[PDB]
Each structure stands twice: as structure tokens, then as C-alpha cells.
Design a protein around this ligand. Sequence first.
Ligand SMILES: CC(=O)N1CCc2cc(S(=O)(=O)N3CCN(c4cccc(C(F)(F)F)c4)CC3)ccc21
Ligand SMILES: [Mn+2]
Ligand SMILES: [Mn+2]
Length: 245
Amino acid sequence: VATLFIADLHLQTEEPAITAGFLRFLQGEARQADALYILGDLFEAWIGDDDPNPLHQQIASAIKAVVDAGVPCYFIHGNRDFLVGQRFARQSGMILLAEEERLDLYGREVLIMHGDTLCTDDQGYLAFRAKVHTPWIQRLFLALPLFIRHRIAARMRADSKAANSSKSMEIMDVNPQAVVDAMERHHVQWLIHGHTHRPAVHELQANGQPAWRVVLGAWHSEGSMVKVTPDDVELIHFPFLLYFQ
Ligand SMILES: CC(=O)N1CCc2cc(S(=O)(=O)N3CCN(c4cccc(C(F)(F)F)c4)CC3)ccc21
Ligand SMILES: [Mn+2]
Ligand SMILES: [Mn+2]
């Protein structure tokens, strides 16, 4: 038995190969887990649950089949899809969780999050995140016509793509002090997150004991997942979908 953790799939229409790899994962590996946690950035973009984007319903139906197969699915918002709301949760059967959750996984206490709130050195993103996460700014954006939200989101992506082109990767990683503060705020020796796209297992010190930070990988050329069993924690890389010469 095991619990699965995925994040940073960045599903979008222009990347059907990633979509097909995620659909195969939901039909096979996901059906065998006690639970499936999606730690943010499931979608490359999200402007509201009323978006009739067909990929949204194709993904919701596939996740609903996993939930119907007896595997509960949970979602934590990422920096790309923080607008995923209760309507999509019902369409997909997923349970939406807070920005930080503490799980009892077979005895070990694990803190789960997306990981973007750990990059406290990036003042540019932190200001952008505080703005787009303010409730009244959200409900104003969501009240606009959908085609207006599309033009807003398209320009903001082009704006941030040209602004991030002049940023150093030293202020864009995880802050080590923020990890210890989070792992001691929740009193855990285990932390799983994504966002940074650097799959790794980092050892640190928290609560006077050794602690570990498990980072998920983004779904680029191949898939990535964290598998937590009663015996071990596994960081797994696998292809989306054999011959001889
Ligand atoms: C660093 C980073 O995370 N970025 C950089 C660029 C980007 C674009 C998108 S998005 O295209 O999915 N879309 C953009 C618009 N957005 C929004 C929400 C609430 C209020 C408003 C405002 F401001 F218009 F009122 C806009 C919803 C999501 C998501 C993440 C990110
Ligand atoms: Mn990501
Ligand atoms: Mn992210």
C-alpha cells in the first residue's frame, strides 16, 4: 500500500503528450493507491471554473474515475491554478486542501504544500502572489466576462515571461530558513512540495531532530511522483507511456 504525490504537470492544450501521460497514470498507477495528492500546478493556467475549456472536463472526468474507483484525490493550489474552485472540485471529485496541510501517513507526520511560499527571496513574485491571492481582487477578476479574463491572463503571462527573463536563479529557489520555520510550525520531520521543478531529497534539522524535504519534479519529458509507504519514501521517475534491434 502507498500514497501518491504529484505536482507541476502544467497541463495545457498545446501539450497533448503530457495530457496522455497523465491519463495513462490515472488509469493505471493511480488506481492502486490509498490516496492521490496533487500539490499544485495541475494546469498551466486557470481563469475560473466556468471556463468551457474541454481539457478541463476531460481531466475532471479522468480524476472522477479514479475517485469512483475508491482512490480519494486531494488538491492544493499552485501558483498557476490558484483559481481552481469548488465547482471543478465537484466535477472531478477532488477535495481541495489549504496552502499547507499536515498528514498522518502511516505514522509519520508529513507537511504538504506547493512550495512557492518557500521562495521568500523573490520579492517580485511575492508581491504578485499577494495581489492575485487577495480575495476582493479575485472576485473582481472572476466577475468579468470570460473573454475579458482570457485577454487579461494572456497579457499577464506575456508580461511575466519578459519580466522573469531578467531574474537570477539565486533568489528564485527555496529559502532554507523558511523550510525550518514551516517544518517547526507544524512539528514535522517530513515535507513534500513541488514548484521548483528540482526533484530531490534534502536533509536538514528541525525540532532538534533530522528532517527531510522531498521535492517533486515537473512533468516535462517524463513523469514524476513521490510514493509514501509504511516502510519508505520514494521519489520516482517514469515515462508517460519495448522493441529490439
Ligand atoms: C508567477 C506566476 O505564478 N504567474 C505569472 C503570470 C501568471 C499567469 C497566470 S494565469 O494565466 O493562469 N491567470 C492570470 C490572471 N489571474 C488573475 C487572478 C486574479 C486576479 C487577477 C487580476 F490581476 F487581473 F485582477 C488575475 C488568474 C490566473 C497564473 C500565474 C502566473
Ligand atoms: Mn510547476
Ligand atoms: Mn509552481
